Amino acid sequence: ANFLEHELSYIDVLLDKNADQATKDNLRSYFADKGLHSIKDIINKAKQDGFDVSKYEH
Amino acid sequence: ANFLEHELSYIDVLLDKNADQATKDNLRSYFADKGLHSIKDIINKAKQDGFDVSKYE
Amino acid sequence: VNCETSCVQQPPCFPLKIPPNDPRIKNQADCIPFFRSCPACPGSNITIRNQINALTSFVDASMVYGSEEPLARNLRNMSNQLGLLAVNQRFQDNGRALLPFDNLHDDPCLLTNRSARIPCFLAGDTRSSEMPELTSMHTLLLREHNRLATELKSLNPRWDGERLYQEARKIVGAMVQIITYRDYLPLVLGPTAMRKYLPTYRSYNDSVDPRIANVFTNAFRYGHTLIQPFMFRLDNRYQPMEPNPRVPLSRVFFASWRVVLEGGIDPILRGLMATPAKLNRQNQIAVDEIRERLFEQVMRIGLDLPALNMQRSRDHGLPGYNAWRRFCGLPQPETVGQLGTVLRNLKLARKLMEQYGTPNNIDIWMGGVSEPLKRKGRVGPLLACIIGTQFRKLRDGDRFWWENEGVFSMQQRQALAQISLPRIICDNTGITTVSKNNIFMSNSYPRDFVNCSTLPALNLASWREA
Amino acid sequence: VNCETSCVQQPPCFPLKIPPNDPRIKNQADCIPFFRSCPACPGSNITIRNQINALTSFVDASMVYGSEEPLARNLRNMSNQLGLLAVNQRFQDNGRALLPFDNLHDDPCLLTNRSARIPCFLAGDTRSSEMPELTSMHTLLLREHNRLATELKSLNPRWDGERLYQEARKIVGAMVQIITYRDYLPLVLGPTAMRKYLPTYRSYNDSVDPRIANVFTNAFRYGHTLIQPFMFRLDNRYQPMEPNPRVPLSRVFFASWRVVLEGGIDPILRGLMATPAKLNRQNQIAVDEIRERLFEQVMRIGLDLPALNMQRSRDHGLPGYNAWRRFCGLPQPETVGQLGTVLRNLKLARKLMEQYGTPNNIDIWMGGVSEPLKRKGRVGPLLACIIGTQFRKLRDGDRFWWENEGVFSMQQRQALAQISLPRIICDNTGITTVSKNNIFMSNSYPRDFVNCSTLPALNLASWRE
Amino acid sequence: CPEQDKYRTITGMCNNRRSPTLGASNRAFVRWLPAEYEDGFSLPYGWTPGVKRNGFPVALARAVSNEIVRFPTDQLTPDQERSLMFMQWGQLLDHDLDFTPEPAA
Amino acid sequence: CPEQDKYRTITGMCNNRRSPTLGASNRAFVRWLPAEYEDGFSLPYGWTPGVKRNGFPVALARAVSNEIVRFPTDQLTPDQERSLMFMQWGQLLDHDLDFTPEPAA
């Protein structure tokens, strides 16, 4: 259930401005298979589990 | 847990004033092991479990 | 859902559905009731479901003495120090003991003859009242216990009740063992399998697992093929007795009143000795009294015992026929033709394949009882392997086996070798004429009968303690 | 209640008590911590208690891929259809992949070298960080999965990531099977036991029960007697690699930082290839690095791995030595003289009797490792029987065994026969010189070593669609 | 388990000193083969409509009984060499060996 | 359990079609011998002070380790014919086969 460090790579590919559409849908369905339906619930799970994800926020 | 028909005969031995004391205490011990510590408890159990006990008045 | 009245399939109910064009149950929305056997670990999804044995595996006469300490105590007469089993306090059988009555919350015996108001009997096992023939045997052993204890008291007056009870029990247990392994099992298995699976006893082996195998509870139901559709009762000339000498089995289940009010255990015992068993044949497996009318007097519908056996095997997760064949080191037929060769009966093979599709899936009881019988036995190779293996474990894995050194003295062992079931009948009933030779084979009066006077009693002189 | 910090015997704690005159633990009120294994049927007074296996019994490389569905997804790289296993996103060893990091509650790997802040690794099995030598082997197999999937991707452009992942996985599983049965088990059992317990493979048998026996979890810990007290690292001339060439084992447990920051896996693999194992001898059973100081950097007290082995066997309700001897068809010594003969060592037999009273009561691990070793094997007859019986069941009762009709084609099987562990090291590390002949016997540089280019690669031409 | 004893326990406990539940009452049967359930671990073959066994439909137990077991009862063959006591000793003996409990309604 | 497949399941379910949990994860070990517990069914030998095993006191595991296993590390004998890779593959292999869970602190 804990967020893993390598899944921080999968937030970069979702935020990539010209990454393939069928790739970015797979990662959303991956994270939605573990209860995380938005990107804002992907950074809020990485937060609680000990990482820094305000390196996207303002 | 149910009182058994053959146990009624133990009630007879316990109310027999001329039965060996050893015999009786053995039967009281048998009944105490089932949670019945006096004769009035033994008769009552027999009653609850369907037997006529009216010859014990 | 209550499994006895509902046909809804919900745990713990696993009702048998009814096929189209059933010869008896025309109502296809009805069902034959069936409660799944209690799981050893309720509600788990780590464990593989297994069932429970409520009795001791050992051949220890636990069907007389009970297998739990509260029950064992209740079966004993606690009003003196004679070491006796409790007897019925309202009825006798020509001056001899009957079993005491149980006090059940839902008592089926009382539903067989309503006016007679005779409940089921209390014994070491809860099924003692299921047929009067079985009741009669439980009653015989009760009496034999009390006789040994009486005789031991006479021999050793200083012995207390606990001593007399245990020593009598130890003899009864030895007697059940001897009759089982000397007289019974050889006629079940036949000589070849007897030698293979039960070689001469050496000594107790503490590495032999004595548990009952799950599969044995199903395979030992082979006996259902031996059941005759009537209870036979014979008078003291071995002639049919009274007005009801041949009662259909569907009117004797739980009919404890027949023992109490229709003439005691003597006529029943004569009936067992002087009537043939049913032969199992591939085309005559089981009689409609158990297949159509099992327990019909005490419940909403008649059960089907063969069908129960196969439903039960599935309940217990038992592997099919080919798997058991393989476990026994017997060839595993794949085709109808191969099954035909194994059964020496292509017709039956075709019938089994029309039902099951592959011999891999034939239920163990059905496949076991379908096999041709071994020479001078009454099971085929598969059931001979399972039954033989089980009884080998019960013998060799039993620290109190009657021939294990230190259990009995040499003198006691020699005394015990003289016991027979015919003699036990003479000593505890009004019967003066009994089966000769092997009681299990002797079956025709007068050809196979002798006077009780020609048989030696069990001599208890080596049980003398100063 | 807390078995780690308390010495109270209350479930689920079964702490090891301390004898008088212990050479290390002077205070008898203390204990060695121990959790009883989880029961299959918790709280029951009908079942006989049994323990759980959380992994697949099959030799299926589940230590790479995981034994549970959620974990298995987590291990995969889901950012492309290349069918790869996720790799570490922060660190590399000289350009090559390291295992991704796990995210545990009480990360023991963080408590070795606190300043480095290198957490434990995530793999198919939870023990991947336990010693860096184990980690290296894990990292090797991860890389070999990625190499294969890459090569297959090239050879079959059509294939989706599922297909690439499964085919690579199936190859990796077959390599673990081949290394294990062709190269490893013969050197464990010796030729005689090998022929008796592993006769040449025939075909899959669906009546063979492939479960791990309870006793095997204890018996296969024979390998604790092979453990050397140091971790050795060697440079690219197979010389001691500075400045920590020989690290005491009690400073490598959970030391994930050593892989990441003290030179990756290459030095460690070279040290496993070019150092001898410890020999099991009757008066040199097991070293004090595991017997006195097991996990001492990450816990209140150093554990005793041999003693834990024995406590565990009792926890699992395992019969003792003579019962296992009998199971195996071996004679059962009853006296000290007879036990002496069986062990070729009356001195050891007296010391076993002084403790146990009867050989009936000797704990299976202690008994097994005490026995003299089979000719050209590293276990005695008791352990050879248990170990050999188990591996036969894993082979004959595995539907996906690599030689089983229909798993691989004849051409694929022929290609697969060419594989070997040294080749896998060539293919996935910066090492160019590797152990020859049998990697498990070869142990001495340079006489036992060859250039990589002398070793044939695995040819995947028979995987072409 | 006491070290000397002289009689059997009622429950069968302590018959086997090293494994004292073996053959005692209210214990799981030993399995000589691994079990075969529809779902692998619990549900019996025939439970779920449509689920096959090893390639084939599960036959209704009552259908097997109707088609294989049933015969005209007046055609019964007596066993020349066994008495009915042979049947009855078998049932008695079974009742010494095993009872598989069921939940009560 | 599907009637045609192509690759292993992750959990091991369905490797054996007739008994599909066999060799799968999160299942009980099989027993080759009956278990031997202090009380027959649960408590390990060594649990209750004073309770012997088969006639003799239970030896403390640490006490056995001290007397039998302990040796002077300077005596360590290298194996001329086995690499350390031989030890390590065995642990790697063990981790493919069995892991026995325990409760967590």
Ligand SMILES: *[C@@H]1O[C@H](CO[C@@H]2O[C@@H](C)[C@@H](O)[C@@H](O)[C@@H]2O)[C@@H](O[C@@H]2O[C@H](CO)[C@@H](O[C@@H]3O[C@H](CO[C@H]4O[C@H](CO)[C@@H](O)[C@H](O)[C@@H]4O)[C@@H](O)[C@H](O)[C@@H]3O)[C@H](O)[C@H]2NC(C)=O)[C@H](O)[C@H]1NC(C)=O
């Ligand atoms: C497929 O594999 C099964 C199982 O094989 C075992 O494991 C493999 C890996 C090899 O080691 C085999 O040698 C092993 O046997 C084979 O089935 C077994 O066949 C043997 C020989 O026919 C069977 O053994 C027989 O068992 C009879 C019954 O008693 C046994 O069980 C009781 C109760 O536990 C026990 O007390 C007794 O000691 C026996 O163990 C016995 O009457 C007879 O003499 C003989 O010992 C064995 O039971 C079979 N097992 C199973 C699971 O069916 C297949 O033969 C094999 N097929 C092929 C083609 O290879």
Ligand SMILES: *[C@@H]1O[C@H](CO[C@@H]2O[C@@H](C)[C@@H](O)[C@@H](O)[C@@H]2O)[C@@H](O[C@@H]2O[C@H](CO)[C@@H](O[C@@H]3O[C@H](CO[C@H]4O[C@H](CO)[C@@H](O)[C@H](O)[C@@H]4O)[C@@H](O)[C@H](O)[C@@H]3O)[C@H](O)[C@H]2NC(C)=O)[C@H](O)[C@H]1NC(C)=O
């Ligand atoms: C006391 O009794 C035990 C048990 O005997 C069994 O049951 C009795 C009633 C008889 O039927 C016996 O014939 C039965 O064997 C005896 O111990 C057994 O000894 C045999 C032969 O030495 C052992 O069999 C060996 O088993 C080896 C290990 O694999 C076996 O177990 C696995 C279990 O999964 C199975 O896969 C495999 O097929 C084997 O069954 C095997 O390598 C070897 O070749 C051989 O088959 C058996 O394991 C013992 N059982 C135990 C210890 O429970 C004693 O010998 C007997 N003593 C005396 C003096 O009579």
Ligand code: HEM
């Ligand atoms: C004399 C008449 C017999 C019966 C009447 C009778 C009935 C049953 C029933 C109802 C069961 C339970 C069926 C179910 O699965 O729901 C049953 C089980 C067993 N039998 Fe039957 N049986 C009679 C006779 C015999 C004979 C002659 C047997 C053997 C020689 C025999 C065996 C068994 C066994 C072993 C069982 C299983 C017991 C258990 O609960 O483990 N029976 N029988």
Ligand code: HEM
């Ligand atoms: C660096 C090498 C090794 C260890 C460090 C190590 C440690 C352990 C520990 C702590 C246990 C558990 C002890 C307990 O019961 O609490 C353990 C168990 C097992 N081992 Fe050990 N081990 C190292 C090395 C090896 C080698 C070389 C082995 C075999 C060749 C080996 C085997 C095993 C096995 C099978 C177990 C039991 C696993 C299970 O949970 O089922 N180990 N090891």
Ligand SMILES: *[C@@H]1O[C@H](CO)[C@@H](O[C@@H]2O[C@H](CO)[C@@H](O)[C@H](O)[C@H]2NC(C)=O)[C@H](O)[C@H]1NC(C)=O
């Ligand atoms: C039910 O039980 C009663 C016993 O209470 C049976 O009645 C006896 O029948 C015999 C004839 O066979 C008479 O000689 C007795 O005098 C009867 N006694 C009583 C109390 O009436 C009755 O026959 C039984 N019913 C069936 C169907 O057998």
Ligand SMILES: *[C@@H]1O[C@H](CO)[C@@H](O)[C@H](O)[C@H]1NC(C)=O
């Ligand atoms: C106990 O034994 C005596 C003497 O045989 C007998 O009269 C009495 O009825 C018995 N009691 C029971 C309950 O069996």
Ligand SMILES: *[C@@H]1O[C@H](CO)[C@@H](O)[C@H](O)[C@H]1NC(C)=O
């Ligand atoms: C996935 O693979 C790509 C390409 O090989 C790589 O750049 C990326 O880091 C990988 N992600 C993970 C988590 O392995």
Ligand SMILES: *[C@@H]1O[C@H](CO)[C@@H](O)[C@H](O)[C@H]1NC(C)=O
């Ligand atoms: C701890 O780790 C750091 C890594 O940056 C290293 O410099 C240091 O030497 C390590 N300490 C020891 C004692 O090995």
Ligand SMILES: [Br-]
């Ligand atoms: Br990472």
Ligand SMILES: [Br-]
């Ligand atoms: Br249920």
Ligand SMILES: [Br-]
């Ligand atoms: Br109807």
Ligand SMILES: [Br-]
């Ligand atoms: Br009498």
Ligand SMILES: [Br-]
């Ligand atoms: Br009564």
Ligand SMILES: [Br-]
């Ligand atoms: Br009637």
Ligand SMILES: [Br-]
């Ligand atoms: Br019944």
Ligand SMILES: [Br-]
């Ligand atoms: Br006594």
